[PDB]
Amino acid sequence: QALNEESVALQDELNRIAETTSFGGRKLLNGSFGEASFQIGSSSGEAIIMGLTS
Amino acid sequence: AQSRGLDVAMRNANDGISIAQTAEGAMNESTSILQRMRDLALQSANGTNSASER
């Protein structure tokens, strides 16, 4: 039971990490990030896709 | 009479030169503005901008 309690605490910690890490207000590991486009070249079109999964 | 006509023609050509130069300066400012707007548009395409900075 004590080990389970510690594991539950660690699990809530995992949830807090998933829900808290933010790059200036933009959640990353929550799951709302999904897929994003990064424009990394001059002119339009030259961009890449960054996918973050919760 | 031809000399007087040449005087008139030179005056008119000079006036046209001045008008062309003024329009060229305005167009130069416009293209600088367009370059800045292109930079802004490229910057906004970045996938780290949430909603507010957009």
Swiss-Prot record, chain B:
Compartments where located: Secreted; Bacterial flagellum
Signal peptide location: none
Superkingdom, taxonomy of origin: Bacteria
Family: Belongs to the bacterial flagellin family.
Primary role: Flagellin is the subunit protein which polymerizes to form the filaments of bacterial flagella. FlaA is required to form a core or scaffold into which the other flagellins are inserted to provide structural integrity. Essential for flagellar synthesis and motility; important for full virulence.
Subunit structure: Heteromer of multiple flagellin subunits including FlaA, FlaB, FlaC, FlaD and FlaE.
Note: V.cholerae is able to differentially regulate the flagellins within the flagellum maybe to produce flagella which are particularly suited for motility within a given environment. A flagellar filament composed exclusively of FlaA is fragile and easily broken.
Name of the molecule in the record: Flagellin A
Organism: Vibrio cholerae serotype O1 (strain ATCC 39315 / El Tor Inaba N16961)
Lineage, uppermost ranks: Bacteria, Pseudomonadati, Pseudomonadota, Gammaproteobacteria, Vibrionales
